Symmetry: C3
Subunit: 627 residues, 3 copies
């Protein structure tokens, strides 16, 4: 009689005036449901967005459900017999387009990731019929895209495709990597071909047919780069030849998003097979019902016996017409022994430009890095991360100068706001290209007042304060320029060879404790004018050889009352309270003139107020006054 609308609100509540079903491997199904009803104003929103099915009398009397979700709907002007209720029926996955995200995945397999999305969604009606094992993707960020988009890209990359199973009350997103996950139609595993020239045969059969071949590229070369093995060559290449002429045009790519040549070949292969599947296509149109995408069936009756064979349907469509059933269907397929693949046509969220993030790591860490200077960050957009070393993977950082164990070293600290960019805008390839001072990260030299100051102030780690720093500052202030040097605790200046110091004006040197100055060879120095030395304690000179005290004018010695004068003319005056001159052997005293004693000739020698400890110390304390 007719195809009964086995749906919500009853079956007979809706009658199938006409249906246009559409199925495709690796894509969302779509069905036009021209359902009609005795209810002249059946509130459309009551089934809009809800699951429903349709029961098609298949071969053997079996039934094909056309289950999906009412994606869209519309009432249609009609007649007292019935009102039209057009509806677009589509599988759960279109719902994934209704939520966008900016979520980081880390070392997770594609199945893991996708299923996790499903777990997040609460999606259960799906099935894992993969045929190829998967590697965990060390980093994979969902970014400015819907879950649908994200997963779709993961799918095409991996050569994954889907088929959906129609069940009266549900519709299963079946994951498949190959024909082994597919099945023949119930009561229709094989079908005759009865060309249109025969009019019609009651057995479901095919009658329309088309075969076409196309020119394709000779090969695909991919390439990539891994800084951890920088000199390694990751270039790969898939070479395929076809029956057509000139099959010799190579394609090249970089980066291919892989670190092993085996992945390069796998993904090149997935892409190539998707392409190769297009080399020759088979089209069929019949009055068949059982067949659909993801089904395996054998054609028979076609003049070409190389067409009379089993096929895996890639594209399928259905036609139902019922006066208030007529039935047609058309296929687009590949041989049943093939593994369907799709090209990565899903758009890639391109990182349009720079985005900052907070440097993070372990909560008790401050310089969270590794041997490459890579760090973890917290992106401002990542509303789902842990703001720690698990918020992202390690990210390389630019330097002022960077070579083989030489160059600058400014390895980020936690809490810094840094600028992240992506290699060719690819969210999975971050790199730090800058650092920005902000309300927290404030400039060493208060701006704009100290805009003329430049250099660097550090901060001790771990746990150093803003006072605990080493620094260098060059004051540019015209007329008051200045080089400030600050060692927070130590200065080791190594001058491997010769050293030189020049001061245009005055030298102010001071040290809190002791100072040792040893000269490997000789030392010579001079003071242009007066050379004064104050000693708060004692003074001791030790020359192994000869020590010459040379001076023009008068050399003077004063120690309390001990006073000695050494005039340039040799008039040497010596005195104090007493004296004792002694020779263990002989002694001689002579004069050029007369020598007398106990005569009053010699007299006391004036100390000039010198040699007084109190005075000396006063000078010393003036030199070293208290702070």
């Amino acid at each position: 009689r007719l195809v009964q609308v086995d749906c919500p609100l009853g079956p007979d509540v809706l009658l199938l005036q006409r249906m246009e079903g559409r199925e495709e491997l690796g894509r969302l199904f779509a069905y036009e449901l021209h359902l009609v009803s005795e209810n002249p104003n059946l509130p459309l929103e009551q089934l809009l967005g809800k699951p429903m099915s349709l029961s098609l009398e298949l071969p053997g009397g079996s039934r094909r459900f056309f289950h999906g979700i009412v994606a869209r709907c519309s009432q249609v002007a009609g007649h007292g017999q019935f009102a039209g209720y057009q509806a677009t029926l589509r599988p759960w996955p279109w719902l994934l387009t209704r939520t966008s995200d900016c979520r980081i995945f880390q070392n997770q397999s594609v199945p893991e990731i996708i299923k996790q999305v499903f777990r997040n969604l609460g999606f259960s009606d799906f099935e894992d019929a993969l045929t190829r094992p998967y590697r965990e993707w060390e980093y994979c960020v969902q970014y400015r895209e819907t879950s649908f988009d994200f997963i779709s890209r993961l799918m095409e990359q991996e050569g994954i495709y889907y088929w959906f199973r129609h069940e009266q009350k549900r519709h299963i997103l079946v994951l498949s990597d190959a024909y082994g996950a597919h099945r023949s139609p119930g009561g229709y595993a094989s079908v005759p071909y009865y060309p249109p020239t025969l009019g019609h045969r009651e057995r479901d059969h095919f009658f329309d047919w088309q075969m076409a071949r196309e020119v394709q590229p000779g090969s695909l070369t991919l390439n990539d780069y891994d800084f951890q093995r920088p000199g390694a060559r990751l270039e790969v290449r898939s070479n395929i030849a076809r029956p057509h002429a000139a099959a010799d045009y190579p394609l090249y790519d970089y980066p291919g998003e892989y670190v092993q040549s085996q992945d390069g070949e796998q993904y090149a292969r997935n892409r190539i097979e998707a392409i190769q599947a297009q080399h020759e296509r088979v089209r069929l149109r019949g009055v068949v019902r059982g067949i659909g995408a993801g089904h395996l069936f054998r054609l028979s009756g076609y003049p070409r016996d190389d067409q009379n064979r089993e096929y895996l349907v890639v594209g399928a469509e259905y036609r139902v017409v019922q006066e208030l059933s007529q039935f047609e269907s058309e296929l687009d397929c590949i041989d049943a022994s093939q593994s369907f693949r799709l090209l990565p046509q899903t758009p890639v969220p391109v990182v349009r430009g720079p985005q900052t993030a907070v440097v993070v790591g372990p909560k008790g860490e401050e310089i969270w890095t590794d041997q490459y200077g890579r760090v973890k960050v917290h992106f401002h957009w990542d509303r789902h991360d842990q703001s720690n070393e698990n918020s992202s993977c390690w990210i390389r950082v630019s330097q002022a100068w960077a070579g083989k164990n030489w160059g600058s070293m400014q390895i980020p600290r936690i809490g810094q706001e840094v600028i992240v960019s992506f290699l060719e805008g690819d969210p999975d390839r971050p790199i730090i290209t800058g650092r920005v001072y902000n309300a927290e990260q404030t400039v060493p030299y208060e701006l704009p007042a100290n805009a003329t100051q430049s250099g660097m102030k550090s901060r001790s780690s771990k746990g150093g304060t803003p006072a605990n720093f080493n620094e260098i500052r060059m004051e540019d202030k015209k007329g008051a320029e200045q080089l400030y040097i600050h060692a927070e605790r130590n200065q080791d200046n190594l001058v491997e060879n010769d050293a030189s110091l020049s001061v245009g004006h005055d030298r102010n040197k001071s040290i809190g404790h002791d100072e040792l100055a040893r000269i490997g060879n000789n030392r010579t120095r001079a003071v242009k004018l007066n050379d004064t030395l104050l000693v708060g304690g004692a003074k001791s000179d030790s020359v192994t050889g000869t020590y010459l005290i040379e001076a023009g004018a008068q050399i003077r010695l004063v120690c309390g009352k001990s006073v000695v004068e050494f005039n340039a003319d040799g008039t040497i005056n010596i005195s104090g309270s007493a004296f004792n001159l002694y020779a263990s052997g002989n002694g001689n005293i002579d004069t050029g003139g007369r020598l007398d004693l106990n005569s009053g000739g010699a007299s006391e020698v004036d100390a000039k107020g010198k040699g007084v400890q109190g005075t000396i110390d006063g000078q010393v304390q003036a030199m070293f006054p208290p702070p």
Copy 2:
């Protein structure tokens, strides 16, 4: 009669054989007309690009105007009686698609900006029927886009739309953000629906009606970030419940282009209104001459009574056929209870990489910055600005090391060629990323010659001449390495605790004026071999405690003829022209052997030319030779 025409080259001269028009709220209109004329060579260019209208014979003989500008035209097939001509009318706003530019706006509301654009255009034919106040865009820029594109984006951002309105001799852009901006045509306050089963009615009526339903998202989350207030959780969310199922899917975006979540909500509301408006669509077809886009009317006669409502036409189709006549129309409308916010369908130019900018400010300034180190810059593409502080807003800049009141920093100067990009390529979110040398701004150490020279050279400010600078110059030249420091002023070497200096060879030191040396505690010095000290003035030793002078081989003192020789063998020789040995108390002169006076045993010890002040001077000036 038929349809009346009113245009350049003659009103009656052209007869509208047929017309296919289209108007939409917030969008450009288009009228395709086929008119015929007794002029067998009607000059296309004399109406192409020109304003003109149609006087549609409304009820009562009133006329509905369809004024527009001939965007396109064509002499087409026709007859000797009336030659055929075709033309496409478009709005004055459409004309903006013919012009493009690169211009920055700063602190202007969208209404303000657009009206200024209108002033630039001379576009006086518009109305301001907006009820909401709009935020001044502190920075917003037109870049490589048409003026139309630019303002279209501004509108969509703020949700602004409009109603094209016509007058016999002009075309009006009725700017709108409110239902009250729209209105019914005279006699079209309530336009009836007279079923198609009636064929045609004498009263402008509708005969078609269609309603369609669509699944909408359920939540919209927007966010943004402010470095000036880094904890600035600018997250904001709009939510909506819909009649259908699956009315709960969340969306997320960041940055939302706002600094206040409330502004974000405006924007969120603009978007969610634009979105939810797609939930249900109402279509009508009739023979109605008056109601079109931006018009109000109550549907009167549709069998489904809850459709006999007042509607606002979102857009409309206009149809003419003429007997050489019937005017017909189709409406796209929303129920009076609904509002409208322009849908975000216009694309935006993206800054896919770095640009060159000039640091600017006051014309007499060298550093134009604020407390965040931000500066204003001038863009090469912004040919409208005067290369000054008004060229752009305060822009953030990457630095060597951001730190909280510490770090490595260098303040930018006016006239510098800098590397600038945008946050995520968004032209309204500028950020300075670096600096680069050029033909004028040459490297500190001229290349390629000075590739071995590295570090940095500053300049004094204001007035940093080539001489006025401080620098760090490191020489990596193999065999001629160096660590050179230049402090054009004072230099402060602070070492909080311990310091050390290692010199592989010789060390030279020279001070232009005096030297202060204050050893907090004890000083120990030594020279492995010889130590020479010269004094150009006087020397003054002042030791608080005991001052011991030891010489392993000989202590010698010479001041001219004053010569004292202390031989290690115990022989003490003292010579000069005279002596005065005196004890305040007693004294003893004893020998183990014989002591003879005027014996001839004592003589004058050779001074060796020492103590000759002139000789000494020779040595001093040897240390301090001219200049």
Copy 3:
């Protein structure tokens, strides 16, 4: 009669049942050959990818040759004698879409680059009929695009076109930018027009015509910038006008991708002239067999005199059907006097973000640069070069300060991995924005193990090893802070004003050889406690002025047995083994008490173990102990 087939699988085996020819200047043709053949199972793959030829009978029996290659071949349900097949004939350039890569072209004219591609693919079937000279570009680059796309784009941007010639067995790509490479249409130098209203005039004439007009812009201003001539005003502008209302709408782009304003003007014209042309075009239809794209002929018979002009066919349509027959043609043209201009409609691969590369240069270099500090790099994506100084053009690099011969200067060396970005994503505008470390280019400080020593390392050049370098480090280690300097050779610290040193604790200086110092004024040295000085050799002080020695407590002189004690009470003890006191004039000795000689009251002063020599030497050796 008809169009005869000349092809693979046997010329007359295939019968042109229906052919849809499509031609256009500056665009690849397509001839859809619907053929029927006595071969009931004609191979598809043996036409596919192969050249095929047609011989369309013209007046006089002349055969208009067609030639192209099959991009697609399909088996169409047909009969025995006439089995249907469908072939897509494309021009050779179509095949260039089958290959894609990347590559840099330096100092290459576009004509040459084109020919390079031809040689690469063996595409000898072309004719160089270009008339304008083209710029030798220092840098063009193919990237992620087919060779076809690359060249097509490359041509569009320079105003280059490519035309075609159907030889019988070959199809020639007549490259040309001037109408001298056009021809009269095989003897149809003038083609009469017969109004369709006259009926189908029995001969090869036109039966249709359509002129159409459009509103155009009025001005295009482009601008660009060159840092090597940074004051450049490369801004260009070319203007147009049209018959319609004021064609005065300005356009503006920056950068316009040119370094020469003359070139910029041409580029403006490359866009503009086509835009100008967009104003008016003509469609023609007839059954004219010898006309087609690139043909120049006069239409003769269109009622409007203005249309009986010479026209250049821009594009064309052909339909050939055969009975075993009918022919029709239609075309898009411009007046022969109108200059054909190709718009830049091919997309340019956008550099979505940063790239990685390595600094390269001549093998004898370690640093390869120029007067701008630019470098050559080899790119990690550049899988098509040998990695040398010609692997790129000169590329700029960011710095910490870019001033006029001042600022920062870090120098990249050959072998360093670098970050390369492109201005606004423009593949022809590379710049280095950061240096990075990798497995080979390791970090100078161990990480995280030695992240506390912020700073830098270097290598002497040329030929400096890890032991030959200069380095700076800052220990930020909390509680172990330290500044450290390594001058591999000498060090020079210049302070032009006052220098100061403050060491909070202890300081240790060690000079490898000789130290020399001088004070340009007086000097005030002091210690707060003890001051000891050891001289391993001899010591000599030469004070040109008075030399006063002040000390409290006691002054001691020790040289072997020659020892003097100066007590603060003025008791002066001078003694040893012998003495010789001599006045060269008079001598006086007096006491206030009794002066006795050989009294026994004088004795040898205790040396205190000092003035020994060997012991003293040992002390010095303690001071300067062996390694």
